[PDB]
Amino acid sequence: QLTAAQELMIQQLVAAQLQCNKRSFSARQQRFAHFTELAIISVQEIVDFAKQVPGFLQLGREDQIALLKASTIEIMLLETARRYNHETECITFLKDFTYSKDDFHRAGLQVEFINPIFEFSRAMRRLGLDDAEYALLIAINIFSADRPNVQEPGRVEALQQPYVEALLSYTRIKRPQDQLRFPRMLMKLVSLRTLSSVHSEQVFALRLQDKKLPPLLSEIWDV
Ligand SMILES: O=C1C(Cc2ccccc2)=C(NCCCCc2ccccc2)C(=O)N1Cc1ccccc1
């Protein structure tokens, strides 16, 4: 019962994620450097992906920037959960680039942020999302009309709706017996906002730690 428009929107998102990912990824100062290098790569990958999401380029440049400024850490955390290895309790950012809890801590993050990231990753895992579902959830995250500094929130909201609708229809076919899978996925967007909040506290704490974000991350995350 997916419409052709919905099937095509999903295929575009799944293909763009694959393409963007292929393009982008084909003492304690080293660990912080390495970790921020992954972030700068991902920041680019997300910009590249968002440009492929239908409707995104219909917004004004300032709104495109404002949506990406808020979404980027949340999408990074989605992509982190997607790469969670439950067997050894780690995140496989890249073939071999694996991070455990202590590796996050040695990069500069506190336990108050680390543990919720792993709790979120386990919650995500229990949902058993597929490529279509991740990609739809990322599109829905991007078109959040409530982000700071959005000039056309109505337009954003309107661009979100077909993605929400497609997710609703897709999930109703994937698991006709589990009506509640769809709202539990939307609830992961709630958790991501809190995670984003804690992230901003972690960035703040770098200052009276010993550390400075590199320029490309300072732009998006230092306020
Ligand atoms: O906040 C970050 C994140 C994001 C993040 C993501 C996941 C968990 C925790 C944090 C960084 N790096 C990882 C990016 C991974 C991007 C990515 C995803 C998926 C696949 C490949 C690649 C990072 O350097 N900083 C700055 C920072 C701020 C405060 C204290 C220290 C450092």
Author numbering: 219 to 244, 263 to 459
What text does the study give?
We have also included compounds AZ7–9 representing a structurally related series where the central scaffold ring is replaced by a maleimide core. AZ6 and compounds with higher potencies were assigned to the first class of ligands (high ABCA1 inducers, ED50 ≤ 11.3 µmol kg−1), while compounds AZ5, AZ8, AZ9, and LXR-623 with weaker potencies were assigned to the second class (low ABCA1 inducers). As no trends toward increased TG levels were observed for compounds AZ6–9 and LXR-623 within the explored concentration range, these ligands were assigned to a “non-lipogenic” class together with GW3965 (C2 = 40.2 µM) and BMS-852927 (C2 = 477 µM). Interestingly, the corresponding region of H3 in LXRα displayed a much broader range of ligand-dependent protection after 600 s: from 60% in BMS-852927 complex to no effect in the case of compounds LXR-623, AZ5, AZ8, and AZ9. Analysis of crystal structures of LXRβ LBD in complex with WAY-254011, AZ3, AZ6, and AZ8, as well as of previously published crystal structures of LXRβ31,40,55 reveals that GW3965 and BMS-852927 are the only compounds not forming a direct hydrogen bond with LXRβ His435 and therefore they do not stabilize the His435–Trp457 activation switch crucial for the agonistic conformation of H12. Other agonists form shorter hydrogen bonds of 2.5–3.1 Å essential for proper position of H12, which correlates with their activities both in LXRβ HDX-MS and functional assays.
The liver X receptors (LXRs) alpha (LXRα, NR1H3) and beta (LXRβ, NR1H2) are members of the nuclear hormone receptor (NHR) superfamily of transcription factors that function as heterodimers with the retinoid X receptor (RXR) and activate or repress gene expression in response to binding of cholesterol derivatives or synthetic ligands. Transcriptional responses of LXRs are known to directly result from ligand-induced conformational changes in the receptor: similarly to other NHRs, in the absence of ligands or in the presence of antagonists, LXRs form complexes with corepressors, while binding of agonist ligands forces the C-terminal helix H12 of the receptor to fold into the active state that creates an activation function-2 (AF-2) coactivator-binding surface. Reaching isoform selectivity by rational structure-based drug design has proven to be difficult since the ligand-binding pockets (LBPs) of LXRα and LXRβ are virtually identical. Since the adverse lipogenic effects are considered to be largely driven by LXRα23,28, drug discovery efforts have focused on developing LXRβ-selective compounds.
